Amino acid sequence: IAHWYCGHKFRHRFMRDKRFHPSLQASHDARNRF
Amino acid sequence: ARAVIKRRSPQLWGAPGAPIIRMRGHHVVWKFQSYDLVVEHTHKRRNSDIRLLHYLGKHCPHPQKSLWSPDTPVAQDRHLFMLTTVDIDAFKYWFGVKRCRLSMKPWALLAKAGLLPPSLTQNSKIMPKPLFDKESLMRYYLANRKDEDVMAREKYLNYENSMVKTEEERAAERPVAPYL
Amino acid sequence: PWWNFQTEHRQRCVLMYGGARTKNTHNANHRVFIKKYKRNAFPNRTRHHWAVS
Amino acid sequence: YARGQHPSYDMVYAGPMPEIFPMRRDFRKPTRWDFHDIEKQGKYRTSGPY
Amino acid sequence: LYKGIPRPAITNLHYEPAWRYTLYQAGAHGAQLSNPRSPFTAKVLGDELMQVRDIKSVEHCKAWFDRLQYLINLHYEAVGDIGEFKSRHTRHVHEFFVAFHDALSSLDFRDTYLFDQFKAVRPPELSDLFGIFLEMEANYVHEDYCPRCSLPYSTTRYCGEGDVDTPFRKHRGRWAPHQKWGREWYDVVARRAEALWYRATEDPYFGTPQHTQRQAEALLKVYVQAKQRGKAIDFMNKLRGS
Amino acid sequence: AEFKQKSRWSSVWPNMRYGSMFLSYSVGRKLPMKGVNWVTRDSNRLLNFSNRYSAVISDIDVKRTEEELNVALSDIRWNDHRRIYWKCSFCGSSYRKNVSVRTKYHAGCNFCKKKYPSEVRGEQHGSPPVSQAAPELTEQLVDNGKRDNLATLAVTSKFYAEWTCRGCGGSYRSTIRSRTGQVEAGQCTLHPDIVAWSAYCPSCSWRPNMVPIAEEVSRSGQFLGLERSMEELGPIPRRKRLA
Amino acid sequence: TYGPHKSYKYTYMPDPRKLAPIETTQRSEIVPQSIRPPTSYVPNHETFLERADIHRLRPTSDFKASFKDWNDLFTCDKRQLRVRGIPRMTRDAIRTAVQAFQNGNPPERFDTKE
Amino acid sequence: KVDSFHANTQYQHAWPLLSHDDLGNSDQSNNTKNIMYSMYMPKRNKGTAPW
Amino acid sequence: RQIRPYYNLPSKSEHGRKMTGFLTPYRHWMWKQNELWRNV
Amino acid sequence: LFFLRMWFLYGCCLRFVLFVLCYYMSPRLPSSGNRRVLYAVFYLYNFVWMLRCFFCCFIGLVMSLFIIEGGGFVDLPGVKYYTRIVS
């Protein structure tokens, strides 16, 4: 995990990755996630 | 066909056309130099890979000893080797079917390989370029002249179909009695 | 020679025997983001760019 | 054997291959780490047994 | 089963062998002469054309055997001074024979086509080769030369001086002093002769199915000149029992 | 010190032929060999081995090794590493090489490296010597005292000797096998007109060899190089045809 | 930071197979060289350069002194032209003119300066 | 592919080792069996056995 | 390129090229001899 | 590892800075003493930035330019940059 990507802490990068998670992808059941 | 011509590297009849076989090689130290026979269009962009019809093969212009072969007392077989890797099928397809062009260095390499006659560039300074006379040429033509029928037959064999079917093959191929 | 070590590299002009001659593009460059806007005054109104994207 | 009825002598039925005759006596061959005096075993001279 | 499309008529190829056609020959496009040993090519060419094309291998084998014979004639005796400061060595002909045997047999370069021409190229005098090697080994045991380098003691003190292909002098090595004759070197020569005798029948290229009286007398000469008493006695007994 | 002109490319390593050996061009290569120190003792001196290296003693250059290199004749050892000046007496040729490669190896005169018609086949030449098979060439060599030694060479040998051409009295370099026109069997054939083109030096070798073509074109009204093939044209087995 | 773990270095061991003598043949033996005699159109190398001065950027006329005579001019190669302090373009022009004359093409080129 | 410093096309077909002159290890007069086994032959990775 | 002999027709024009594209009849004849080798 | 410490380096390990001020700072207790701190100024992308660094360099002359390196962790509470060693 490159330090410049997203925030300084790694949980920023992990939260940014979690928005692209296939299981949580936007759909009828899970919508307006952000 | 440009307002300001690229004077450094001009060509003829514009782009893209007339595929031509050349020998591309990056300008490096001579001891690490090796060219690549390749067929490409007349005009090439900054990177040669844009216009690349086919790849003929590598050529190393370094005379090397035959270490792979055993140490043989044959004098000719112990001369230095200049290895060149070339393709035959693609070369013939581009030369004949598509009627491509060749540069002097690939022509000389292929003449060495036996695919082509010696190029016009390579000439012996000892022997001057001769001249011709119509009367003497006519005299030689009358002295020896081939038959029209045999010349037509050999032209047909050389240019048109040459793998002909003879009467033995025709009799073998003809249908058998039950379906007659 | 990518498989050779740094000190084992006698020369870099060609591949002596065979393999893959690949450019060693430097991935570890330490790219830097320069903050040019106030925290609550990023010009965009929906998405904010506060780091290397 | 062609009809799969011959008693199969598979290699796995073979056990250990015993040493019939004793090969020889391997005497202690000289090495850089075996010297009567330790003077010749120095960091400027000796880096290993061989 | 019958809804959607009629069965293609090309499925009949799998049930009728009558439609399997190869309208042209395998090499009908001019490759009929690709194989050099095919009966078709041999018939279409003729014996004279065959010898014309094989003259290359014939002359290769001729050059090999001529060079081997010249080296044998030059180094028949292992002691002497052929050049200004170079001596005779059996090692040169040994290396040449090893190179020839590797060209004939070694799987790194399977140049086995030379063996086909042994019938018309091999000299009758060189038909017995390991006997010649045994004779050279017998000559190698002269007491005035180093058993290791075959150099005279009077003119040289280090082994391999004045020899281009010396294996006793590497790029950054040290000169090796002349070795003095002894029973150790006599036994070394005896073991070399034994190995030569075994190879004389083991070799399938230059070896003979049965040993030669020339080889036997050469081995006896080796034994007598190396002063192997019991070894020579046992060799004589086994010669009687052969 | 020594000061010369230097350019950016001047730091490019030179090419090394197959015959050439390892070169100590880099400082890393120079350091280990500079580490060792040499000395000439009684057992190390070359003059004490004249019974074996008499050829080396004869071929060494007495004078030019003292002024240009400041190394004594009695200081040079038989395994000397520094390159000194040599005057090969087989052809009287000057060069510069060390004594280690002359004694341990056989690396002497560069011209004499091509003494025999084949580098691989040294003494296998069955050709008669020049002094027997061509008495007309010994008089054309440059008079330097080694004419007899060069005349002892084979006719087909590949020696690169000097010749005073009769066209303009000039000394040009050519090969004796090229001059004689014949080559040993099994080697690469030479040019058919090599005798005519090697008779003179390159400056005066153009007109005399172009006289016959001028005569031919004047006679026939045209010049054509194929007359050589025509005179050859003026049974042979063959294969069958599949067409 | 400290450096490479082990500097990989290799010995030099001479190879007898690589150092074995190699057959060679001079290219002059296959094709003998020759120097064309001066003609009426070109009596000397000086007027040869004068004729071979066509480009404004290739002043081959000014280098009469560098070449001693006809033999020197027709024998010096490109490397010799370089070591004689001749610029690349003009030395290439001189070499091409010499080669054309040897082939049989005199320097009959119109001056393009005007 | 062609006409570049890193043009990796002529290395995709088999070729013998080049020994015209010194290629960094004095290949013109050096027996390069060990050199071929340890440097020239491609490996699975840095330091692994030759492929 | 196309070779232009020095002994050709000089275009007496300052507003254009200094040499013409014509040629001497000898130049035409010798060109044919050279072109004959090209056809061979 | 800490990546926000080297904020003023901006990627490069060496920062070419000028010299304006030099004072003394007391390191965090119990490590009592005075340490020489250099208040330096540089300009990057037409923007001037000033930073406090550790004056590790020994004085042998008068200097107006300095090289800022990341260094390690120092007991001084707030400064995170060292001066290049004198060569």
Added chain:
Amino acid sequence: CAFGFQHAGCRINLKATNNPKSPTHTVEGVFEAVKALRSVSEIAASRG
């Protein structure tokens, strides 16, 4: 090596920086791993 193993590889807590890390933990973890090893003959007997 003291245990006599010739073909084995042991790893503790992935990268060495990962906690906990102490000599006592390093010794006891590898000893526990070696103790919890089942021989091939024992596995075959268990499988019958």
Added chain:
Amino acid sequence: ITFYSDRFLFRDLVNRREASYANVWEMDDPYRFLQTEQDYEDYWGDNYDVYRRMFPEMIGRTGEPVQQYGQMPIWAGPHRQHANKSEHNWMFAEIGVNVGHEALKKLELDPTNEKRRRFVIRQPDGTLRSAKMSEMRAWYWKEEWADFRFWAPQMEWGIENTPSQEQYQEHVPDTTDADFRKQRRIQSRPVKWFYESHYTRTGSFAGFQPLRFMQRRTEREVRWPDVINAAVQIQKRKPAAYIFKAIPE
């Protein structure tokens, strides 16, 4: 490691229990263990006397001859005749799609194939001929052949095979005698495979890693002290101010 069922032997047991023989020597012949030619080769590959006659085709006896190809006529005649004559051998090998695959080396080298790989060797005299088998095989990636079945091949990366720098990163004198480092008394060197029998030479093997020289994941053995490093580097202490030479040289 394989686990069979405890009744796995039933298939062979019924054969052994219901086998019948004419005589007892047929029952207890010592060659009942050999069934196929592979078994016979594995059994009689030790001695050469039986092998050389039982398997005559193992030794290469007849190879591909070298022939000269008919040259293409050059209509220019003697003017371009010199062009084909050079001072170097010209080696040309065909490539393509079918040609060049190493997996099909046997088919490409097999003369009985009309699509075999083509080669040309133009000699300096100007004539072209077919390449030798060695030259044909030179256009493929090298492979090592070795078989440990009967005789151990010359193993690479050994005490004697490897040179000084590859052994200990230091120069040692390369002497034929008095080499305590190599643990030998005298090494008189004959030709490697002259006296030794040909069949004893089974090739060489180099498909492994020399652990002393080059290994995977060269990491420091222990961090502190910093002096120690990876096991691949074993060196002695460097002297200081070795020696100086008065002679210029």
Added chain:
RNA sequence: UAAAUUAUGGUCAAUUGUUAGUAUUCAUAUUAAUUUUUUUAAAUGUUUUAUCAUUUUAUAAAGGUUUAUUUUUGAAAGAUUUUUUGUAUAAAAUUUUAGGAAUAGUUAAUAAUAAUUUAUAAUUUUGAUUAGAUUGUUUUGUUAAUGCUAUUAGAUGGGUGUGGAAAAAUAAAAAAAAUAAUUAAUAUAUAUCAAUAAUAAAUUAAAUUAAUCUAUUAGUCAGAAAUGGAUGCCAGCCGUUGCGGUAAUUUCUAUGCUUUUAAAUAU
């Protein structure tokens, strides 16, 4: 819901950082790369012709694009000749930002329509539109490995619209309508690329053509190796835990020692 075998086959998966009660991948290792010891220009006149003209010479960096870049055989290759046969501008999918809301000469039908036709139009919370960032889907680095981390050069509007095709305003490693050259690969000034450069780091010599050339090894508390003097929480040192309070194995310095070796330091 049966075992296997006519016995290793079909070609190598393998992990190494001396910590510090415990929780959590976060100081110091190795590889790859940058950094010191001064390695490393992108050339100035393209050519021919029927003469104030005509014919041949079509993608270099400039402009910041995430629902996005897509097209010709009319020139040329190209051939007894005439003649003939065909196209093609369109798509589909992958599309970045910590804190997220509206967008627009606009959708469809019609037509060689409509600045002024007809219609309940189109985009978007399944993340649109503006804004910021970055030249897009064969390139690396690391690892045993589903990962993580890189990559390049070039399509930035028209406006007498030449041409087959605008790519058309300095920038070559492109021989361009006569064989200029094949002994050629060598390349002397002004902004830049890897030809940039990696070369037996110290004992028997270079089968040659002898051509280019110097830098302090860093430490010595823990942990390879330290004793005397001076300082006395001062001056300073410090990858780390920390050291300096009058015997300091941690500072400075004399001397001595250590090193698995060619640096040191940082990101």
